[PDB]
Amino acid sequence: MLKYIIPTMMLMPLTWLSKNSMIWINTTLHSLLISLTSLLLLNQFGDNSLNFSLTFFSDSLSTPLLILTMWLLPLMLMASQHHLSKENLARKKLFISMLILLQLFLIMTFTATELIFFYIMFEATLVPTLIIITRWGNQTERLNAGLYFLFYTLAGSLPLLVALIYIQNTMGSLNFLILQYWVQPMPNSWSNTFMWLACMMAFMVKMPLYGLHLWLPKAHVEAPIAGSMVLAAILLKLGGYGMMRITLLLNPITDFMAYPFIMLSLWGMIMTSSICLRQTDLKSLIAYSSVSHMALVIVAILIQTPWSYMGATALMIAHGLTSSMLFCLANSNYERVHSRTMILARGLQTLLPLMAAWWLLASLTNLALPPSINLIGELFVVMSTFSWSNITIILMGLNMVITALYSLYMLITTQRGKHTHHINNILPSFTRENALMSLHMLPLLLLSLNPKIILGPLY
Amino acid sequence: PGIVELPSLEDLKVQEVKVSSSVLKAAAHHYGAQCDKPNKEFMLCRWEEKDPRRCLEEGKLVNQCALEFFRQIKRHCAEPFTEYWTCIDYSGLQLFRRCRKEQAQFDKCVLDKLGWVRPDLGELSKVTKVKTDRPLPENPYHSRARPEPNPEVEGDLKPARHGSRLFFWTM
Numbered sequence: 001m002l003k004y005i006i007p008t009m010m011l012m013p014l015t016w017l018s019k020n021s022m023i024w025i026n027t028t029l030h031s032l033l034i035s036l037t038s039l040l041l042l043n044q045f046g047d048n049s050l051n052f053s054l055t056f057f058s059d060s061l062s063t064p065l066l067i068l069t070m071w072l073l074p075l076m077l078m079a080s081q082h083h084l085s086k087e088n089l090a091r092k093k094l095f096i097s098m099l100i101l102l103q104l105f106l107i108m109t110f111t112a113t114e115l116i117f118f119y120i121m122f123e124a125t126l127v128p129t130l131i132i133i134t135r136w137g138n139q140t141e142r143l144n145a146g147l148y149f150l151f152y153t154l155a156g157s158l159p160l161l162v163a164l165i166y167i168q169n170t171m172g173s174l175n176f177l178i179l180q181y182w183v184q185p186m187p188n189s190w191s192n193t194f195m196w197l198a199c200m201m202a203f204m205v206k207m208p209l210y211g212l213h214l215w216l217p218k219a220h221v222e223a224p225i226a227g228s229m230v231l232a233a234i235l236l237k238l239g240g241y242g243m244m245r246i247t248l249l250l251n252p253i254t255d256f257m258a259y260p261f262i263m264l265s266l267w268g269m270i271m272t273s274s275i276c277l278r279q280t281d282l283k284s285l286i287a288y289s290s291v292s293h294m295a296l297v298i299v300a301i302l303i304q305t306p307w308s309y310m311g312a313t314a315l316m317i318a319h320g321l322t323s324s325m326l327f328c329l330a331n332s333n334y335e336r337v338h339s340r341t342m343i344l345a346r347g348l349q350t351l352l353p354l355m356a357a358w359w360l361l362a363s364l365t366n367l368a369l370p371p372s373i374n375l376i377g378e379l380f381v382v383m384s385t386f387s388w389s390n391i392t393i394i395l396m397g398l399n400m401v402i403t404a405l406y407s408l409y410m411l412i413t414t415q416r417g418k419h420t421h422h423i424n425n426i427l428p429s430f431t432r433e434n435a436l437m438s439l440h441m442l443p444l445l446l447l448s449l450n451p452k453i454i455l456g457p458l459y
Numbered sequence: 460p461g462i463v464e465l466p467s468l469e470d471l472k473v474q475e476v477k478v479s480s481s482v483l484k485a486a487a488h489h490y491g492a493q494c495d496k497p498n499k500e501f502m503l504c505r506w507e508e509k510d511p512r513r514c515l516e517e518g519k520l521v522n523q524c525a526l527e528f529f530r531q532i533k534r535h536c537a538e539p540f541t542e543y544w545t546c547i548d549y550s551g552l553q554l555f556r557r558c559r560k561e562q563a564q565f566d567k568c569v570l571d572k573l574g575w576v577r578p579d580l581g582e583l584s585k586v587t588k589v590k591t592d593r594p595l596p597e598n599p600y601h602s603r604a605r606p607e608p609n610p611e612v613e614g615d616l617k618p619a620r621h622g623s624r625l626f627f628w629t630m
């Protein structure tokens with residue numbers, strides 16, 4: 001994995017030795033080359049993971065997250081170069097450096113063979129993200145957004161450090177390859193109960209769990225667009241990746257300890273989706289939709305059946321692409337009306353027809369339209385939770401009603417109806433913006449032709 | 460612990476040297492000359508045994524040899540010695556320097572009638588060798604077995620197995 005870490009590192013001289021006008025072009029070009037190179041991680045086998053070294057490996061779980069991670073960086077650089085056009089050159093290079101450093105931490109968060117190196121990169125992803133949100137955010141509440149984002153995360157993860165060092169001292173190694181073969185059954189005790197909670201609550205925070213989700217609608221709406229894209233697309237999926245690694249060790253206690261965290265998810269995806277029926281802010285609606293979609297991934301990991309893991313990893317990749325596109329579309333309106341209010345600018349299919357087609361496709365992939373990988377992940381989670389308990393289909397099916405009822409409402413409020421009369425700075429769609437929407441949607445649609453590369457280690 | 464083992468009262472009875480300190484200090488140099496051998500056997504036994512209970516008999520030899528020192532003064536030179544310890548006995552600090560004429564008379568009468576040379580300045584502070592037949596005490600501190608020390612380090616120092624082994628550092 002050292003053929004991906006060193007090009008990402010070499011993007012630091014590439015953004016700091018460039019001309020004052022070429023720093024977006026060079027970083028976009030070479031990060032697109034790194035994203036093209038990311039497809040060599042598809043050397044996956046039906047029995048063995050792709051094990052590079054003592055430090056780095058990549059199974060079929062980490063590989064789609066890595067391809068999505070290395071693909072998201074040129075897209076964040078395309079989204080972020082408009083609102084940072086008046087920016088100082090040094091601060092512009094600092095923003096590009098924080099995105100590069102965040103990519104560098106993510107691509108060896110997902111490949112960390114050993115779990116405390118996973119912890120160090122997993123908690124190292126805070127600091128560039130914190131700096132991006134609290135420095136290049138727009139409003140007053142970006143500082144409170146950074147405080148909530150930092151102190152839910154570290155409150156969840158500082159027990160995780162102690163739990164991982166306990167596993168290091170007890171088992172002898174936090175190598176995930178050794179812990180596949182030295183895993184012992186975790187019995188029923190209070191020590192093992194708080195062992196389970198210390199292993200899980202960090203990822204429950206970063207997914208987010210319902211009830212712990214309160215950092216997210218502050219951290220998504222107060223971030224800039226590259227921050228919103230990286231929290232939606234990747235930084236929620238650190239929790240899912242970490243759960244799918246750490247629930248190996250947490251058996252058979254999970255089979256009676258996951259009950260409060262499934263209910264909180266199965267009712268919470270009803271609540272947050274319901275919140276999306278009444279959100280006046282468009283970016284907050286996309287944030288609460290992200291909570292609603294990651295609650296299904298929480299249920300699918302906690303029931304730990306194979307169909308559930310396959311649906312959860314397909315749902316993570318699909319939701320990453322879809323929610324990143326939704327934040328980019330909301331940014332496309334915010335760069336024209338300079339307010340995130342969803343009822344402000346209406347009727348925008350008369351004014352931006354092709355951008356309304358991109359809104360339509362992103363709204364259809366939000367509501368899980370088949371055969372998209374959104375519906376593949378949604379459907380497989382619903383199948384495995386029907387296997388879990390037959391009554392859950394109620395809480396599933398009702399959610400699939402409400403997920404439609406805000407996916408099209410967002411389509412009808414922003415793009416349909418009579419347009420706002422007193423708004424006249426509605427420019428035609430830039431080629432940068434349509435390129436950004438197409439680079440989100442066209443991989444999301446091509447992955448319907450071959451979904452087997454985004455279905456985890458147990459396809 | 461154990462019973463302390465003391466000698467009886469009959470074991471300690473000996474004919475004491477019942478003279479005053481000025482009588483002793485007046486005869487001190489000739490006592491250090493003539494009564495050398497049992498005194499040094501006793502003080503050697505006293506620093507080697509480190510226990511007075513194992514030094515009584517030699518000590519009795521001291522109390523045997525001092526009295527024969529004084530009787531040999533009493534048989535021959537009782538009156539110049541009597542004047543000399545009286546003159547020593549007058550002073551508070553008991554100065555030898557205030558009594559040099561009685562010292563000269565006592566030393567002359569002793570050297571004539573008994574043939575004793577007074578030790579010079581420096582002789583009585585010498586460290587002398589003592590020929591005894593008593594055994595050397597093999598454990599005068601009544602000590603016991605010292606504990607076994609920890610084993611030392613040996614063997615050639617090989618490198619560390621797989622480096623530091625600190626969570627993920629492969630060196």
Ligand SMILES: CCCCCCCCCCCCCCCCCC(=O)OC[C@H](COP(=O)([O-])OC[C@H](O)COP(=O)([O-])OC[C@H](COC(=O)CCCCCCCCCCCCCCCCC)OC(=O)CCCCCCCCCCCCCCCCC)OC(=O)CCCCCCCCCCCCCCCCC
Pocket residue numbers: 353354357358360361364365369370371372373442445446448449
């Ligand atoms: C590996 C090779 C693969 C080759 C094949 C490609 C495979 C799929 C790739 C993506 C295909 C869709 C891309 C086009 C849509 C986005 C752009 C757009 O706005 O188009 C309008 C525009 C035409 O409009 P216009 O009149 O010029 O002006 C626009 C209007 O102003 C405003 O526009 P509008 O209002 O007129 O249009 C809105 C309308 C709205 O219509 C709809 O939304 C209705 C259609 C969707 C719902 C109903 C169907 C559900 C699925 C059933 C069909 C699939 C399965 C069938 C198989 C049998 C059964 C299983 O959109 C459409 O009709 C688009 C048709 C395609 C829709 C596909 C489904 C998207 C819905 C969301 C997800 C659904 C599940 C996933 C499906 C995955 C399929 C693979 O299109 C173009 O200009 C096309 C440009 C070139 C597109 C290239 C696409 C491929 C790129 C991949 C590159 C790399 C690989 C190389 C292959 C290249 C192939 C050429």
Ligand SMILES: CCCCCCCCCCCCCCCCCC(=O)OC[C@H](COP(=O)([O-])OC[C@H](O)COP(=O)([O-])OC[C@H](COC(=O)CCCCCCCCCCCCCCCCC)OC(=O)CCCCCCCCCCCCCCCCC)OC(=O)CCCCCCCCCCCCCCCCC
Pocket residue numbers: 001002005006009010012013052053054055056104120627628629630
């Ligand atoms: C004929 C006689 C002469 C022949 C000469 C032939 C050779 C000529 C060249 C000689 C000079 C040395 C060149 C490098 C040798 C290979 C080192 C290497 O890649 O180790 C892989 C090392 C372990 O990978 P591996 O797959 O297990 O084994 C591959 C090797 O065989 C690993 O081999 P190993 O087992 O022997 O490695 C020992 C151990 C193996 O590693 C471990 O045991 C794992 C733990 C390592 C530390 C993890 C700490 C995590 C928490 C802190 C993270 C900080 C933030 C991350 C970086 C942010 C950017 C600043 O490494 C360490 O203990 C050293 C710590 C890492 C330093 C690596 C050397 C860097 C030199 C250049 C510095 C440039 C900035 C680097 C980034 C700064 C942070 C390091 O990878 C990492 O730890 C991940 C980070 C990447 C390493 C540094 C990349 C070096 C090239 C950078 C070029 C681009 C720079 C752009 C500007 C600066 C950044 C903004």
Ligand SMILES: CCCCCCCCCCCCCCCCCC(=O)OC[C@H](COP(=O)([O-])OCC[N+](C)(C)C)OC(=O)CCCCCCCCCCCCCCCCC
Pocket residue numbers: 152155156159162163166191192194195197198201205212
């Ligand atoms: C995000 C907000 C909520 C955060 C919740 C975080 C998880 C909740 C539980 C965390 C417990 C603390 C870490 C436990 C690590 C367990 C390691 C282990 O093996 O323990 C076995 C050991 C057992 O000891 P032992 O295993 O060494 O003993 C030898 C073995 N026997 C038992 C056979 C003798 O457990 C403990 O010692 C105590 C475990 C419970 C700890 C109670 C104190 C902490 C209380 C909860 C704090 C939660 C966060 C607070 C912050 C909130 C925000 C400000």
